[PDB]
Amino acid sequence: VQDALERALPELQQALSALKQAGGARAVGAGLAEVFQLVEEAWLLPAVGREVAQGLCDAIRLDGGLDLLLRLLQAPELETRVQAARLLEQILVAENRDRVARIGLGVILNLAKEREPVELARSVAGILEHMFKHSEETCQRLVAAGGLDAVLYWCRRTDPALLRHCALALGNCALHGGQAVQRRMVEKRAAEWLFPLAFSKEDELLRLHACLAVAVLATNKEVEREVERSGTLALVEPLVASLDPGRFARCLGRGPDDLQRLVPLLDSNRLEAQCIGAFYLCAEAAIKSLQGKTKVFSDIGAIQSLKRLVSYSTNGTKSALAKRALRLLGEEVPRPILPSVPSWKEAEVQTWLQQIGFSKYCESFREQQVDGDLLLRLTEEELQTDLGMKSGITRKRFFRELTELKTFANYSTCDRSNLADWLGSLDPRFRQYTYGLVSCGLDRSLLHRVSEQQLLEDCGIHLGVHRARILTAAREMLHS
Amino acid sequence: IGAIQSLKRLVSYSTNGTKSALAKRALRLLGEEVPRPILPSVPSWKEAEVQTWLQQIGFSKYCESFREQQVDGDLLLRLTEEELQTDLGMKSGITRKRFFRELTELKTFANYSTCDRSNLADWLGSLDPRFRQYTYGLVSCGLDRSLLHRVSEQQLLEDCGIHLGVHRARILTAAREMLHSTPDVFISYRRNSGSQLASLLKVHLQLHGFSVFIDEDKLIQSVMGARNFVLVLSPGALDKCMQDHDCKDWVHKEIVTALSCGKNIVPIIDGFEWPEPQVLPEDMQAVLTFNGIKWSHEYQEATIEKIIRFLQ
């Protein structure tokens, strides 16, 4: 456990002293091959070699070997360049990236232009893959310079190991880039270069990481139009329907900082991003449930998002993956709600409260006898006085859940002229006011004679922007 | 003097590695803990990010005031005077004003990629870099750049929550003065050897504006709708089309349909020798006479240019 470090430290001390001593061509590459072979032997220990490899990379950093690699990447030869590059590919851990981001940027960026041999490119793609995981500043310095161009040119190749590093580099750049980095990637059409990486029938991990990069680019609202025009979203949904997370749980762990990146994939109301997030959180929930670290999903809060995915599902694949992810954890799976909300009695409202996280007020609704018709017509004052929900923040969380409910609702028992589809064609956040306008006796043939006070007092539209938009639309297109 | 809280603000609000490293080293040489950089996706925050933000900016006493109320980032971006005063136990207006100063500093440094459709935060920053704090005020009301010419002052006061009338007048004036204004190429391929080549052809043709389709109800109508035709000849592409008189292969159906149309067939040869006409059906022998284009992996751009020069 600790004696492997005692075996591997003085050997790397002698090897780095030999690398400092040698200044030729073949001896330097032989020393780099010896260091790289010792690092490869350090990778392959069962549940031991992780901390051992981290300690050996820290010892290489403290011996000044990182600056030695930065000087050997400036060497005018070709062989010792690819051995130093393949060694620097495996040395890069969570503590070396700061020292490489301070100094080493510009040297690796220079090798990003030299693209013709495969032995350079397969490792420089992995070095850029590691360097996109540092911060947003390093992502800006790589994308604004010729670092993104290297990956977008190397997506053309057929190397099954290089394209994995390219897909992971684009995914980690989309995760840790920001706004302008994603704008510069999609204006340079980085989502279109992921089409051979999401369709290649030789590797499936490569297609999964390509679909991850496509989904993370598709979680930005100013980006989704050109991603839908690219056509790489349509390969996401069958592929996730074709694979199994229990097989890919061994190849795919990550820390909690990367576990925080998979949660807004589910709360970004896109089908492909929710499928990718459900598949990855199911596989990594199998990972964290094999061990005893299931508190991380409750700390970050993906469990309530998976419950929302189960209770608000229109797709069988993401619902099955969310049910499997909640089954691999230590809580019960919820049931899909009945969409006919005006047809709800009391027990459906109680089940809805038990599923969305309002259990404490369950006995607050049973004594008051609230069904779906009273749930669709509930205001501030009845929550505050009659229901014992005195906190306005708790009331606002209840109105957010009521927005999520009245978006996903079947109004077939009350809507005469299909008003919900018109409200959705205006803006998909307007359908929550459908019950506001159907219960007042309105249809498509009357909205040209409705004022603002009738939308405020009777229909209950509290936002004046939405009132102005509904009045303008009802006077411009429903006047005939 | 109070430089420690400023160094904590420098760590928690950093976009530069140098000043953040110097502030972390300065807080490490002192006798307190260094903070972590916050996650910029504030509408993607759950409760623990809000708790960490409170522990970093100096609002520890109200941490248990936000955990019982279950405040996430979406409730943090939408918090007012009355909910601070009544629900959260922050009775002092000076403490509320310090919280709104920290909320100004937070909503300046925020990632709105999960909600902003038309890039409103950059417009608000181009007006004045203290306006981006109202970005969540205007995105959550359903507004974008194409609607702000029909917004009044009451909609900015009540709905958007802009309390300063100077900022309301500037936003209204700016919004009224500057914001007032069938496929073509079908690709046939073998689904076991010519998938990556067909995908790469589709990408390099959609880079030049060509509407390219990929993958008897839909495929024959896709051949009928496409103006051109590109055949991928992988090693083993015409293997299942040999002695296929019973019309079983999909590539057989696509080649027979394309020769029944009369479209511009451009074959793409990637290490595949030319087959014989007698092992193929007669109606698909005419593909053996078209001028094909070889594929070069090192010179792909000139090959795609040669493909574009042989199309409509």
Residues of chain B found within 8 Å of residue A202, distances taken between Cβ atoms: 196
Which chain B residue's Cα is nearest to A305? B46
Per-window interface: B 155-184 vs A, CB < 8 A: 155, 158-160
Sequence-distant (6+) residues with CB within 8 A of A37 are none
What the block records as the tokens of A217 is 């680019």
Residue B17 CA, distance from chain mean position: 26
Q: A185 near A217, Cβ under 8 Å?
A: yes
> Residue A91 annotated as binding?
yes
Sequence-distant (6+) residues with CB within 8 A of A49 are A4, A42, A43
- Kindly write down the DSSP assignment for every residue of A334-390, as one continuous string: PPPPPS-GGG--HHHHHHHHHHHT-GGGHHHHHTTT--HHHHTT--HHIIIIIS---
What the block records as the tokens of A262 is 């998979």
Is B254 an active-site residue?
Answer: yes
The closest CB to that of B75, out of A196, A396, A464, belongs to A396
Q: A242 near A208, Cβ under 8 Å?
A: no
- DSSP, res A333: P
- Kindly write down the DSSP assignment for every residue of A409-454, as one continuous string: ---TTT-SS-HHHHHHHH-TTSGGGHHHHHTTT--TTTGGG--HHI
Give dist(CA B63, CA B65) in Å, integer: 5
Q: Sort strands B185-188 and B264-269 into parallel, antiparallel or unpaired.
A: unpaired
| Contact at CB, B195 and A200, closer than 8 angstroms | yes
What the block records as the tokens of A17 is 């002293």
Q: A406 near A341, Cβ under 8 Å?
A: yes
Around A141, how many Cα atoms within 13 Å sit in the side-chain half-sphere? Answer: 23
Cβ atoms < 10 Å from Cβ of A263: 21
Rounded to 5°, the CA angle B229-B232-B234 comes to 165
Please report the number of interchain residue pairs, chain A to chain B, with beta-carbon separation below 8 angstroms.
Answer: 127
Give dist(CA A57, CA B103) in Å, integer: 41
Burial of B242 (0-12, 13-18, 19+ CB in 10 A): middle
Sequence-distant (6+) residues with CB within 8 A of A437 are A419, A447, A459
Give dist(CA A171, CA A212) in Å, integer: 6
B17 touches chain A (CB under 8 A): yes
Sequence-distant (6+) residues with CB within 8 A of A12 are A35, A38, A56, A59, A60, A63
Sequence-distant (6+) residues with CB within 8 A of A435 are A342, A376, A377, A406, A409, A411, A414
Closest CA to B46 of A302, A210, A29: A302
Per-window interface: B 179-238 vs A, CB < 8 A: 191-192, 195-196, 199-200, 202-203, 206-207
What the block records as the tokens of A326 is 């909640």
What the block records as the tokens of A320 is 């099955």
Q: What CA–CA distances, in Å, run from A356 to A184, A303, A331, A350, B94?
A: 38, 11, 14, 10, 36
Which chain A residue's Cα is nearest to B148? A465
Sequence-distant (6+) residues with CB within 8 A of A452 are A464, A467, A468, A471
Which chain A residue's Cα is nearest to B17? A137
| Contact at CB, B141 and A465, closer than 8 angstroms | yes
Sign of torsion over alpha carbons A169, A173, A174, A180:
negative
Around A381, how many Cα atoms within 13 Å sit in the side-chain half-sphere? Answer: 1
* H or E stretch covering A201: none
Where b means 16+ CB within 10 Å and e means fewer, A170-208 reads bbbbbbbbbbebbbbbbeebbbbbbbbbbbbeebeebbb
Q: A265 near A215, Cβ under 8 Å?
A: yes
Which residue shows structure tokens 């205001």?
A379
Closest CA to B88 of A356, A400, A360, A394: A394
The closest CB to that of A394, out of B69, B74, B159, belongs to B69
What the block records as the tokens of A438 is 């159907």
Burial of A285 (0-12, 13-18, 19+ CB in 10 A): buried
Around A58, how many Cα atoms within 13 Å sit in the side-chain half-sphere? Answer: 9
Give dist(CA A238, CA B113) in Å, integer: 27
A98 touches chain B (CB under 8 A): yes
Give dist(CA A137, CA B6) in Å, integer: 21
Count of residues making up chain A: 480
| Contact at CB, A221 and B70, closer than 8 angstroms | no
Per-window interface: A 432-451 vs B, CB < 8 A: none
Q: What is the 3-state secondary structure (H, E, C) of A410-422?
A: CCCCCCCCCHHHH
Q: What is the 3-state secondary structure (H, E, C) of A135-176?
A: CHHHHHHHHHCCCHHHHHHHCCCCCCCHHHHHHHHHHHHHHC
How many angstroms away from the CA of B147 is the closest CA of chain A?
9
How many angstroms away from the CA of A4 is the closest CA of chain B?
32
| Contact at CB, B154 and A464, closer than 8 angstroms | yes
Beta-bridge partners for B268? B232, B293
Per-window interface: B 46-105 vs A, CB < 8 A: 46-48, 69-71, 74-75, 78, 82-83, 86-88
What the block records as the tokens of A248 is 């890919």
Rounded to 5°, the CA angle A123-A124-A129 comes to 95
For an interface test with B, the pick among A204, A222, A461 (most B C-beta atoms closer than 10 Å) comes out as: A222
Give dist(CA B140, CA B159) in Å, integer: 9
What the block records as the tokens of A188 is 């340079």
- DSSP, res A116: S
The closest CB to that of B196, out of A193, A200, A299, belongs to A200
The closest CB to that of A468, out of B116, B150, B207, belongs to B150
The closest CB to that of B111, out of A157, A178, A199, belongs to A178
Q: What is the 3-state secondary structure (H, E, C) of chain B?
A: CCHHHHHHHHHHCCCCHHHHHHHHHHHHHCCCCCCCCCCCCHHHCCHHHHHHHHHHHCCHHHHHHHHCCCCCHHHHCCCCHHHHHHHCCCCCHHHHHHHHHHHHHHHHCCCCCCCCCCCHHHHHHHHCCCCHHHHHHHHCCCCCCCCHHHCCHHHHHHHCCCCCHHHHHHHHHHHHHCCCCCCCEEEECCCCCCHHHHHHHHHHHHCCCCCEECCCCCHHHHHHHCCEEEEEECCCCCCCCCCCCCCCCHHHHHHHHHHHHCCEEEEEECCCCCCCCCCCCHHHHHHHCCCCEECCCCCHHHHHHHHHCCCC
Give dist(CA A292, CA A143) in Å, integer: 39
Q: Which amino acid is at B114?
A: T
Give dist(CA A346, CA B162) in Å, integer: 40
Per-window interface: A 304-343 vs B, CB < 8 A: none
Resolution, given in Å to one decimal, reads 2.6
- From the list B33, B64, B83, B254, the catalytic residue is B254
Reduced to 3 states, what is the DSSP secondary structure of residue A195? helix
Give dist(CA B296, CA A212) in Å, integer: 30
The closest CB to that of A392, out of B86, B117, B147, belongs to B86
Per-window interface: A 249-308 vs B, CB < 8 A: 260, 263-264, 267-268, 299-301
Cβ atoms < 10 Å from Cβ of A52: 20
**Binding site residue list of B for NAD(+):** 190-191
Per-window interface: A 109-148 vs B, CB < 8 A: 116, 135-138
Q: A162 near A125, Cβ under 8 Å?
A: yes
Instruction: Give long-range contacts, CB 8 A cutoff, 24+ apart: B290-297.
Output: B290/B265, B290/B266, B291/B266, B292/B233, B292/B266, B292/B267, B292/B268, B293/B266, B293/B267, B293/B268, B293/B269, B294/B269, B294/B270, B295/B197, B295/B268, B295/B269, B295/B270, B297/A156, B297/A157, B297/A158
Residues of chain A found within 8 Å of residue B48, distances taken between Cβ atoms: 299-301
Beta-bridge partners for B212? B185
Q: What CA–CA distances, in Å, run from B209 to A152, A223, B184, B223, B264?
A: 18, 19, 10, 19, 18
Phi first, then psi, for residue B269 (nearest 5°) are: -95, 125
Measured between its terminal Cα atoms, the distance across chain A in Å is 81
A67 touches chain B (CB under 8 A): no
How many angstroms away from the CA of B282 is the closest CA of chain A?
32
For an interface test with B, the pick among A139, A184, A221, A303 (most B C-beta atoms closer than 10 Å) comes out as: A221
Residues A253, A255, A258, A264: what is their CA dihedral angle, to the nearest 10 degrees? Answer: 90
Q: A150 near A113, Cβ under 8 Å?
A: yes
Cβ atoms < 10 Å from Cβ of B18: 10
Reduced to 3 states, what is the DSSP secondary structure of residue A332? coil
Give dist(CA B290, CA B287) in Å, integer: 6
- DSSP, res A56: H
Beta-bridge partners for B266? B230
Q: A283 near A245, Cβ under 8 Å?
A: yes
Q: A272 near A231, Cβ under 8 Å?
A: no
- Kindly write down the DSSP assignment for every residue of A225-284, as one continuous string: HHHHHHT-STTHHHHHHH--HHHHTTT----HHHHTTTSTTTSS--HHHHHHHHHHHHHH
Give dist(CA A269, CA A252) in Å, integer: 25
How many angstroms away from the CA of A152 is the closest CA of chain B?
12
What the block records as the tokens of B111 is 């990632």
For an interface test with A, the pick among B144, B203, B301, B303 (most A C-beta atoms closer than 10 Å) comes out as: B203
Give dist(CA A223, CA B114) in Å, integer: 10
* H or E stretch covering A22: none
Give dist(CA B195, CA B29) in Å, integer: 58
Closest CA to A318 of A227, A210, A245: A245
Give dist(CA A326, CA A321) in Å, integer: 9
What method was applied to determine this entry?
Answer: cryo-EM
| Contact at CB, A101 and B17, closer than 8 angstroms | yes
Burial of A334 (0-12, 13-18, 19+ CB in 10 A): buried
What the block records as the tokens of B102 is 């920290």
Residues of chain A found within 8 Å of residue B145, distances taken between Cβ atoms: none
Q: A136 near A181, Cβ under 8 Å?
A: yes
Closest CA to A184 of A136, A231, A229: A136
Which chain B residue's Cα is nearest to A219? B114
| Contact at CB, B86 and A136, closer than 8 angstroms | no
Given its phi and psi angles, is residue B150 left (phi above 0), alpha (psi -120 to 50 degrees) or beta? alpha
Burial of A464 (0-12, 13-18, 19+ CB in 10 A): buried
How many angstroms away from the CA of A415 is the closest CA of chain B?
24
Cβ atoms < 10 Å from Cβ of B135: 23
Burial of A457 (0-12, 13-18, 19+ CB in 10 A): exposed
The closest CB to that of A260, out of B17, B39, B83, belongs to B39
A480 touches chain B (CB under 8 A): no
The closest CB to that of B16, out of A137, A157, A299, belongs to A137
Phi first, then psi, for residue B97 (nearest 5°) are: -70, -35
A220 touches chain B (CB under 8 A): yes
Which residue shows structure tokens 């009338």?
B165
Around A454, how many Cα atoms within 13 Å sit in the side-chain half-sphere? Answer: 14
Reduced to 3 states, what is the DSSP secondary structure of residue A37? helix
